[PDB]
Write a protein that binds this ligand. Structure first.
Ligand SMILES: Cc1noc(C)c1-c1ncn(C)c1-c1ccncc1
Length: 121
């Protein structure tokens, strides 16, 4: 267990680029980490965005968030680069702005400021 609740991380999920996140406790499982059905470790994260979402992410797709400029280093992991779609870039920029504000906070302040409120349907 390398991450705890309130830690800032980058997550690489689905078709999306490396995205700013905060580790949090799953609202139903009440754990922030688990061993999945394939026997691998996963972390529960909140994506920083104007569209709040959460996901369980494989530990190999999670990295410590040290700052927004670290994005280049994650891409490093003729030069070939994927283009950046406008709508997705705008959502990522909002997320980064939140992550940069969260980085100036203590872990306790971040937990209080950003932990999602979940409402049953
Ligand atoms: C979208 C969406 N809906 O559920 C999940 C999970 C996602 C998702 N998967 C990976 N990223 C980066 C996201 C995401 C979440 C919020 N805003 C922008 C993107």
């Amino acid at each position: 267990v390398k991450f705890q609740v309130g830690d800032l991380v980058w997550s690489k999920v689905g078709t999306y680029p490396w995205w700013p996140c905060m580790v949090s406790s799953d609202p139903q499982l009440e754990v922030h980490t688990k061993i999945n059905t394939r026997g691998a470790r996963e972390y529960h994260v909140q994506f920083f965005s104007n569209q709040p979402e959460r996901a369980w992410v494989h530990e190999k797709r999670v990295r410590e968030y040290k700052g927004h400029k670290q994005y280049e280093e994650l891409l490093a992991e003729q030069k070939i680069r994927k283009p950046r779609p406008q709508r997705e870039r705008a959502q990522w920029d909002i997320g980064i702005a939140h992550a940069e504000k969260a980085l100036k906070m203590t872990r306790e302040e971040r937990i209080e400021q950003y932990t999602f409120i979940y409402i049953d349907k």
